[PDB]
Structure 1
């Protein structure tokens, strides 16, 4: 059981975006962002096992993807410092969240797939 999954693709090369740093944060009571989990995407551009059902309670989360580092390593000058995804996790809706982001030097697209499957 994996409640939160992250997927990153490269629109320049038509490949998974590998070894991309991802930091997850949870909004705290003082309105500040508290480190929650982190990792680097795998050979398939994915990051799993960030959290468990027990720890993933309702609240506001921020997913930060270090896109600038990724492009620099390819020798490409990017526009964005990073890509950020801020959302509320609600117990009402589906239980699994997939955050998928597509990267270009000057653009990114992000989508969420929320399922019970």
Structure 2
């Protein structure tokens, strides 16, 4: 898969499990078309969101439901979610979106290889 999502918990020092992630692609009318989604695994990872054929150039949004996660832990969060918006190519790779979560802070990083 050319697109993977890895989420970590900076309060507990652990992968975030069962966190909902939605992926959108920007449409012609500049609205967000649902594209893919899932829930992070026990390793805090989400694989097999798309394929090389489906993942064409364009602008994508990755939305991590961080609020629901912190609610499950009984911790009051600041953000409604974590949103990463990026342009796939040019030109032509494997994308790993990493997210490090705290209740009042998050960081996201793109690891782009091949």
SS in 1 for 2:49: coil
What is aligned with 2:97? 99
Separation of aligned partners in 2, 1:63 and 1:110? 11
What is aligned with 2:71? 72
After TM superposition, which residue ranges in structure 1, 4 or more long, deviate above 3 angstroms?
A: none
TM-score norm. by structure 1 comes to: 0.96
SS in 2 for 1:81: coil
SS in 2 for 1:69: helix
Query: How many matched pairs?
Result: 114
Using the TM superposition, give the Cα deviation of residue 92 of structure 1 relative to its aligned residue in structure 2, in angstroms. Answer: 1.4
SS in 2 for 1:29: coil
TM-score norm. by structure 2 comes to: 0.98
Q: 1:111 aligns with which of 103, 109, 112?
A: 109
Note the aligned Cα RMSD (angstroms): 0.7
- Unmatched tracts of structure 2, length 5 or more: none
Separation of aligned partners in 2, 1:30 and 1:92? 24
Using the TM superposition, give the Cα deviation of residue 91 of structure 1 relative to its aligned residue in structure 2, in angstroms. Answer: 4.2
